[PDB]
Design a protein around this ligand. Structure first.
Ligand code: CLA
Ligand code: CLA
Ligand code: CLA
Ligand code: CLA
Ligand SMILES: C=Cc1c(C)c2cc3nc(c4c5[nH]c(cc6nc(cc1[nH]2)C(C)=C6CC)c(C)c5C(=O)[C@@H]4C(=O)OC)[C@@H](CCC(=O)OC/C=C(\C)CCC[C@H](C)CCC[C@H](C)CCCC(C)C)[C@@H]3C
Ligand SMILES: CC(C)=CCC/C(C)=C/CC/C(C)=C/CC/C(C)=C/CC/C(C)=C/CC/C(C)=C/CC/C(C)=C/CC/C(C)=C/CC/C(C)=C/CC1=CC(=O)C(C)=C(C)C1=O
Ligand SMILES: CCCCCCCCCCCCCCCCCC(=O)OC[C@H](CO[C@@H]1O[C@H](CO)[C@H](O)[C@H](O)[C@H]1O)OC(=O)CCCCCCCCCCCCCCCCC
Ligand SMILES: CCCCCCCCCCCCCCCC(=O)OC[C@H](CO[C@@H]1O[C@H](CS(=O)(=O)O)[C@@H](O)[C@H](O)[C@H]1O)OC(=O)CCCCCCCCCCCCCCC
Ligand SMILES: CCCCCCCCCCCCCCCC(=O)OC[C@H](COP(=O)(O)OC[C@@H](O)CO)OC(=O)CCCCCCCCCCCCCCC
Ligand code: HEC
Ligand SMILES: CC1=C(/C=C/C(C)=C/C=C/C(C)=C/C=C/C=C(C)/C=C/C=C(C)/C=C/C2=C(C)CCCC2(C)C)C(C)(C)CCC1
Ligand code: OEX
Ligand SMILES: [Cl-]
Ligand SMILES: [Cl-]
Ligand SMILES: [Fe+2]
Lengths: 30, 51, 137, 36, 97, 244, 33, 51, 37, 334, 33
């Protein structure tokens, strides 16, 4: 149960990277 | 006396039904050691579904 | 504590004669020990053979005895094994081998007894640190 | 193992040639600026 | 019933004197005239039935026969222990300073 | 003329025993009145077969092939010994010195790694009675000692050892010590093994022989921590005998 | 390994509880104007 | 032993429970060996069969 | 990028919240005994 | 035009979400190879004999580790500095037993990490920027070069490099202290002043700017909404911050110039970490820290211990215990 | 009693997961208008 718990958290942090980059809030100028 | 259906294996028999029987670790579900299943082993088809 | 003449007094040879050292001979006998011996005999041990030391008790039961001046001077002229059966001047620094150990061409008679004095006075100071090794550092 | 060795030697050679001929393809002229 | 064989041997004469059948060669340094010449012969001709059997080693000079005779009081023999003679441990048991 | 050290470094031939031509099928005269020795004895293992092992007590189980992970470090070489002529014409080889041991770790199906000490220490091997010459039908059958895979100064991950280290599980100070007795008290093993040396190629001119061998022995028991595995080693050998 | 039995539910709730707190606040912000 | 392992009710797929989770080995245990075929007799010496 | 013509907001009023929480809770109160077993 | 010209325009395109570039042609495959192998090794790699004494060390999660203790174990001491790719082992099982994956990871990593530094110059050149951000990144990069290659080179084996794990790094720091006394070496001391002052100057500059924001929001909403992306105005009063910090110390101990200030913030930690990288790279060739053991001695000859002699005691404890079976001789010279 | 070891986390997630699904929908609804 431990090994599944560590890799599951690791996978969420990697999935969090994909959204924080390609689905960020666009910075716009004015 | 301890086959796959005594251990609650669900997808393992479906892989064995269509010809995937060996593992990269060197064992076979028939009991034969010294085999070389190539890439299409249990670990290979699992990685193939992950990739 | 001071560097007293009592501490600087060591046996001369086997009959029980004593010779007292000045502070001059102890320091240069310590400098000349670092010069020609400390690479193998730092702290009183032997790097190339830890089975032997330079503690006085060890030098006492050597054959011939070396817990005195004249014995140590003889060992630096013609070294022997721990029992005296072999002569190891071909693998140990000495004046008989000053051709193959160039650091022994400097030392004369006065220098060799100064080193011998330091080997006998220092264990009366550090105690077990002399010839003890890393356990007593 | 020898088959794998040849593949890596080809893959590595392919990417290092893209690197050398990439900079040689007029790199200093690729700037938002004066182009010469 | 699992006993440490080295600890058990310490409760014998091995833990009191120089055991001619097990003790490392670096123990003949304690007394005068045993190291290195005679020490090499004692380990080479081991094991011995009794301590006096060390006096019949081939080629002993008339007098190294005698330095022995002055050091029998520090000699003993026990049963040869395997974990103590294997690996050449009687010549280098991993203990330096 | 052949090779130097710079011609073999890194090639792997340093791990291989010498060989003889297929045309070396002669016979070595053995004089019953002379002394003889084995100047060099070399054994190169080519196959490692390990036991298998539990569970159902059905049949006498069979050696499965295993797979080496310690690379080219498994061969024995430069072993010398005295070759006797016994009163019944047979010849006994008595081992004396040489590189007669190599720690070997093989892996089998499932991932389990089997450490072992492939050795021929204190080997005595005799032939059949009345050997008037070393022919291509001669064969030696011997017996050797297998000391523990690790000596007495070795320590486990938690510091416990035989001639040194702790004598308890210090990490669990107030735990029960009885179930931990097997792992706390180290035990030095000493078993025996059997080997058959079958000569196949004989050069009665120079005194060199070659052939195959098959030995059986136990594996590492981890100083009494677990049951050892039976192993069967196969390979070829090379030996040069000499009048002393 | 003999690990703690409550460690699984300890990690699971340690992740879940503050996660949904931020998720609720975000979805209710984008639904505004 | 493979044939005797089939003729035995612990492998019947109609002996489980809806909330009896896990493998079959969690139930009766991990099969080790066939103890043998039992033969029952009374005092007269005739063979009896268990229902 | 042009917005998508096919999106509509989602609603859940307070009554459906109480109904949903109720159903979820007693469903858990009923099955918990069987999960513990 | 031709396809090669069109390809060169795409590699150097400033409109990509993630810039590729000619350094990126090498960086992407080398990094992807290193992480994919690292992730798989950290989870399911079998034990590794690092010290070459047939004593494997478990390092993966499936073999009884957690995130704190798991590690990718360095290659065997029997290999030393020898190149050990997959095709030099008779199989994968032999490759995993001798610490094969460790070499493949650190090699593909250091390669991609260096191209990552050049990639910083490349995009700076295409955007009209000054080029010296890569120079600041050279300090952490040279640090990775020291503990992964420069030190195994000077000692002669990759088994002595820093493991790829949390507890593995702790094992690298303790042994490095017992054999080199890194704490008494000035370069590690300069490295501590760089990281302590780096965090000090980070908290300071961050506080003083957040102490003098122009009031442009209410109390109900966040202060960050007083700044908008791309505005020409500076959202904090610089001379107001100079008037505060110049009175805490004295007027001339404060930076009135913004460019001189951010240079100091970049200079201090970078050259400081440069030294602690050079400290590891020099102690790799066994030029260790200051040795003051038994350096104070009384009028007779008794050793008057100092705090340095106590450090020598703790060092002796680590040295006599590390790699408890790898040594057969009284000196550990590598 | 010797219960199922995972019945605790099975029950905890049986409640938590669908509950916060409905909470997320309700809070974003009230925040509209
Ligand atoms: C087709 C689906 C299917 C099937 C037949 C199996 C079959 C099996 N799996 Mg698998 N499994 C599946 C999908 C499936 N699996 C999926 C999708 C996952 C991912 C989570 C897993 C993960 C998994 C693990 C991790 C393990 C198994 C194991 C097992 C074995 C034991 C199963 C057991 O104890 O049942 C138990 C079944 C129940 C207790 C039934 C629960 C019924 C629910 C609670 C009803 C819900 C009612 C509903 C809420 C009411 C609605 C009300 C209305 C108003 C809406 C068996 C071989 C085990 C095994 O043998 O390992 C080798 C094991 O360790 N499975
Ligand atoms: C950017 C691409 C790239 C690069 C540079 C590397 C680099 C490397 N890999 Mg990797 N690899 C890659 C992609 C890459 N990899 C990919 C995509 C895969 C997946 C299939 C792999 C799979 C892989 C495996 C499985 C292994 C490696 C290994 C290696 C190492 C040995 C390579 C070798 O022998 O080539 C040598 C190169 C040559 C002989 C080229 C000579 C010919 C050219 C033209 C000369 C030009 C170069 C010259 C020296 C200098 C000019 C440079 C320029 C700046 C001027 C090396 C660190 C091995 C390893 O790490 O072992 C520890 C190993 O086992 N690779
Ligand atoms: C108060 C206590 C204290 C402090 C503050 C320090 C401070 C320091 N020590 Mg010291 N140390 C101490 C006590 C202390 N030490 C003690 C008591 C010991 C004895 C046990 C040591 C033994 C010791 C050793 C042996 C070493 C240090 C080193 C260091 C430095 C570590 C920082 C570094 O290398 O960054 C530099 C930055 C890096 C190394 C990171 C590089 C990052 C790369 C380029 C990219 C990685 C990206 C990643 C893989 C993936 C990105 C993720 C992303 C995609 C999300 C620093 C100067 C090390 C040093 O100076 O070497 C350089 C070193 O080797 N220390
Ligand atoms: C009690 C407070 C205290 C003080 C004053 C120091 C001071 C020092 N430590 Mg120490 N340290 C402390 C606690 C302290 N430490 C604690 C609690 C730990 C953990 C147990 C450490 C662990 C530690 C390590 C591991 C190391 C140091 C080192 C240092 C030196 C450099 C640190 C540095 O530049 O920081 C960064 C901060 C700044 C750059 C800001 C400026 C600070 C300076 C020193 C003030 C000088 C002002 C000056 C005297 C006034 C001039 C007036 C006039 C002339 C104009 C310095 C002598 C290093 C060392 O030994 O170097 C020789 C080193 O390697 N420290
Ligand atoms: C231990 C301390 C430490 C770490 C971990 C760290 C980490 C990082 N700093 C970066 C940058 C920087 N750091 C800088 C100054 C400093 N950095 C410092 C200290 C650190 N900096 C210090 C003290 C300074 C002051 C001098 C600068 C100036 C920069 C940058 O410009 C750069 C950046 O962009 O920051 C935002 C990033 C490099 C990105 C990269 O190479 O991607 C490439 C690698 C990728 C994408 C993945 C690699 C994954 C590899 C293959 C994993 C396997 C191999 C690993 C080495 C495994 C080891 C891990 C174990 C030890 C647990 C990264 C987030
Ligand atoms: C009981 C009795 C006798 C009572 C009498 C009491 C009494 C009032 C007596 C009067 C007599 C009296 C005054 C006696 C004096 C006694 C005395 C001198 C005591 C000694 C005390 C003492 C040792 C003090 C220590 C001195 C000290 C604090 C030194 C600091 C040194 C130091 C490194 C300073 C930092 C310098 C510096 C270059 C920092 C840069 C950091 C930096 C990048 C900050 C970022 C930053 C900077 C900016 O600049 C601005 C702008 C912004 C934006 C910004 O980000
Ligand atoms: C996604 C996240 C969403 C939230 C997740 C919420 C999880 C809660 C789900 C509760 C049900 C889980 C059962 C808990 C009981 C238990 O402990 O199981 C635990 C069991 C595992 O069982 C464990 O097995 C172990 C050996 O591996 C040991 O033997 C343990 O003793 C044994 O408990 O889990 C499962 O069996 C999972 C697979 C279930 C597959 C069932 C398929 C048949 C279901 C038919 C569905 C039809 C229903 C239609 C209704 C309309
Ligand atoms: C016996 C000894 C014999 C001599 C030996 C000499 C040895 C070498 C001496 C070194 C001299 C180098 C001078 C450098 C000047 C310079 O950099 O100017 C560049 C700028 C220009 O200043 C700005 O300059 C502007 C004017 S101008 O640019 O200079 O024209 C001005 O507008 C502004 O006020 C001003 O701030 O300087 C600064 O902004 C001030 C901060 C400089 C501090 C640098 C810190 C570097 C870290 C040190 C490493 C230790 C810490 C890390 C380890 C813990
Ligand atoms: C509401 C505050 C709660 C603070 C609690 C944190 C205590 C931490 C210890 C002290 C460090 C103090 C340094 C403060 C630094 C400081 O100066 O703060 C000041 C800041 C408020 O400052 P301003 O209102 O000026 O903020 C300006 C903002 O616009 C930010 O730019 O407070 C916060 O941001 C608090 C953030 C705490 C964030 C911590 C996250 C907590 C996560 C906990 C995870 C829990 C797991 C749950 C398990 C179920
Ligand atoms: C390098 C190795 C050296 C050097 C440079 C010196 N000595 Fe020593 N020493 C060395 C060995 C290997 C041995 C033992 C040899 C053996 O017993 O077979 C010794 C022994 C001594 C002894 C006798 C110790 C004893 O009997 O217990 C003495 C007194 C001695 N050495 C002194 C000495 C001096 C004065 C030296 C330089 C001035 C010197 N040695 C150099 C190894 C080495
Ligand atoms: C074309 C191109 C490109 C792209 C590229 C790419 C995308 C690449 C990728 C690549 C990749 C993606 C690679 C990868 C690699 C990987 C690897 C190299 C891996 C390995 C691994 C291993 C070896 C493992 C092993 C193991 C272990 C460790 C344990 C368990 C068992 C096993 C066996 C599994 C670019 C953009 C630049 C541009 C130019 C052109
Ligand atoms: O390997 Mn890792 O650590 Ca560098 O010293 Mn020598 O070798 Mn081992 O001991 Mn100390
Ligand atoms: Cl260690
Ligand atoms: Cl060694
Ligand atoms: Fe700033």
């Amino acid at each position: 149960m431990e090994t599944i718990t560590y890799v599951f958290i690791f996978a969420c942090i990697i999935a969090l990277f994909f959204f924080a980059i390609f689905f960020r809030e666009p910075p716009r100028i004015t | 006396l301890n086959p796959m259906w005594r251990q609650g294996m669900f997808v393992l028999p479906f892989m064995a039904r269509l010809g995937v029987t060996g593992s990269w670790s060197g064992w076979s579900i028939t009991g034969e050691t010294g085999i070389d299943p190539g890439f299409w082993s249990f670990e290979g088809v699992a990685l193939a579904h992950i990739v | 504590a001071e560097l007293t003449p009592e501490v600087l007094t060591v046996p001369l040879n086997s009959e029980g004669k004593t010779i007292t050292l000045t502070e001059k001979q102890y320091l240069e006998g310590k400098r000349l020990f670092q010069y020609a011996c400390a690479s193998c005999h730092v702290g009183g041990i032997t790097k190339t053979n830890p089975s032997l030391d330079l503690r006085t008790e060890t030098l006492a039961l050597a054959t011939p005895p070396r817990d005195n001046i004249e014995g140590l001077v003889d060992y630096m002229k013609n070294p022997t094994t721990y029992d005296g059966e072999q002569e190891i001047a071909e693998v140990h620094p000495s004046l008989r081998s000053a051709d193959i150990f160039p650091k022994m061409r400097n030392l004369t008679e006065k220098d060799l007894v100064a080193i011998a004095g330091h080997i006998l006075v220092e264990p009366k100071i550090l105690g077990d640190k002399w010839g003890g090794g890393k356990v007593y550092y | 193992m020898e088959t794998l060795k040849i593949t890596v030697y080809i893959v590595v050679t392919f990417f290092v040639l893209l690197f050398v001929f990439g900079f040689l393809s007029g790199d200093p002229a690729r700037n938002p600026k004066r182009k010469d | 019933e699992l006993v440490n064989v080295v600890d058990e041997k310490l409760g014998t004469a091995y833990g009191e004197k120089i055991d001619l059948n097990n003790t490392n060669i670096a123990a003949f340094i304690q007394y005068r005239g045993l190291y290195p010449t005679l020490a090499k012969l004692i380990v080479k001709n081991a094991p011995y039935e009794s301590v006096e059997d060390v006096l019949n080693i081939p080629g002993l000079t008339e007098r190294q026969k005698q330095i022995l005779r002055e050091n029998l009081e520090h000699f003993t023999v026990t049963e040869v222990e395997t974990a103590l003679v294997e690996g050449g441990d009687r010549y280098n048991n991993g203990l330096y300073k | 003329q052949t090779l130097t050290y710079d011609d073999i470094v890194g090639t792997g031939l340093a791990n291989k025993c010498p060989t003889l031509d297929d045309t070396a099928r002669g016979a070595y005269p053995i004089d019953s009145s002379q002394t003889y020795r084995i100047a060099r004895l070399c054994l190169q293992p080519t196959t490692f077969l390990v036991k298998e092992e539990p569970k159902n007590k059905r049949q006498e189980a069979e050696f499965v092939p295993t797979k080496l992970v310690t690379r080219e470090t498994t061969s024995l070489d430069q072993i010398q010994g005295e070759l006797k002529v016994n009163s019944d014409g047979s010849l006994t080889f008595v081992e004396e010195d040489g590189i007669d041991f190599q720690p070997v770790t093989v892996q089998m199906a499932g991932g389990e790694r089997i450490p072992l000490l492939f050795t021929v220490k204190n080997l005595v091997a005799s032939t059949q009675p009345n050997v008037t010459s070393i022919t291509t039908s001669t064969d030696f059958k011997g017996e050797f000692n297998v000391p523990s895979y690790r000596t007495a100064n070795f320590l486990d991950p938690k510091g416990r050892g035989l001639a040194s280290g702790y004598d308890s599980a210090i990490a669990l100070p107030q735990a029960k010590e009885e179930e931990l007795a097997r792992a706390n008290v180290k035990r030095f093993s000493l078993t025996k093994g059997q080997i058959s040396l079958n000569v196949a190629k004989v050069d009665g001119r120079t005194g060199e022989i070659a052939g195959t061998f098959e030995s059986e022995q136990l594996s590492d028991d981890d100083m009494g921590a677990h049951e050892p595995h039976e192993v069967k080693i196969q390979g070829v050998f090379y030996a040069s005998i000499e009048p002393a | 390994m003999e690990v703690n039995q409550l460690g699984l539910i300890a990690t699971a709730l340690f992740v879940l509880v503050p996660s949904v707190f931020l998720i609720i606040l975000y979805v209710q912000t984008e639904s505004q104007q | 032993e493979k044939l005797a392992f089939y003729d035995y009710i612990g492998n019947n797929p109609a002996k489980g429970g809806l909330f009896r989770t896990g493998p079959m080995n969690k139930g009766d245990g991990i099969a080790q060996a066939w103890k043998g075929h039992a033969v029952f007799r009374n005092k007269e010496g005739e063979e009896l069969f268990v229902r | 990028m042009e917005p998508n013509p096919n999106r509509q907001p989602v609603e859940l009023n307070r009554t459906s919240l109480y109904l949903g929480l109720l159903l979820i809770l007693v469903l858990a109160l009923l099955f918990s005994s069987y999960f513990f077993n | 035009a031709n396809l090669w010209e069109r390809f060169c325009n795409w590699v150097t395109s400033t409109d990509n979400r993630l810039y590729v570039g000619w350094f990126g042609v090498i960086m992407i495959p080398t990094l992807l190879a290193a992480t994919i192998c690292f992730v798989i090794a950290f989870i399911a790699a079998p034990p590794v004999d690092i010290d070459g004494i047939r004593e494997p060390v478990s390092g993966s999660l499936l073999y009884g580790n957690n995130i704190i203790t798991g590690a990718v174990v360095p290659s065997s001491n029997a290999i030393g500095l020898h190149f050990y790719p997959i095709w030099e082992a008779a199989s994968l099982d032999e490759w995993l037993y001798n610490g094969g994956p460790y070499q493949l990871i650190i090699f593909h990593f250091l390669l991609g990490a260096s191209c990552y530094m050049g990639r910083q110059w490349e995009l700076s050149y295409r955007l009209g920027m000054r080029p010296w951000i890569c120079v600041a990144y050279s300090a952490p990069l040279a640090s990775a070069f020291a503990v992964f290659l420069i030190y195994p080179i000077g000692q002669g084996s990759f088994s002595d490099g820093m493991p790829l794990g949390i507890s593995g790094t702790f094992n690298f720091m303790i042994v490095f202290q017992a054999e080199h006394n890194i704490l008494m070496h000035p370069f590690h001391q300069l490295g501590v002043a760089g990281v302590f002052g780096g965090a000090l100057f980070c908290a300071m500059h961050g506080s003083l700017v957040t102490s003098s924001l122009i009031r442009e929001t209410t109390e109900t909403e966040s202060a960050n909404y007083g700044y908008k992306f791309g505005q020409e105005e500076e959202t904090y009063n610089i001379v107001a911050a100079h008037g505060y910090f110049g009175r805490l110390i004295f007027q001339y101990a404060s930076f009135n110039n913004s460019r001189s200030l951010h240079f100091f913030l970049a200079a201090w930690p970078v050259v400081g970490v440069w030294f602690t990288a050079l400290g590891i790279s020099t102690m790799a060739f066994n030029l260790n820290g200051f040795n003051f053991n038994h350096s104070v001695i009384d009028a007779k000859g008794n050793v008057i211990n100092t705090w340095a002699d106590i450090i020598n005691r703790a060092n002796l404890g680590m040295e006599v215990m590390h790699e408890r079976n790898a040594h057969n001789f009284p000196l550990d010279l590598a």
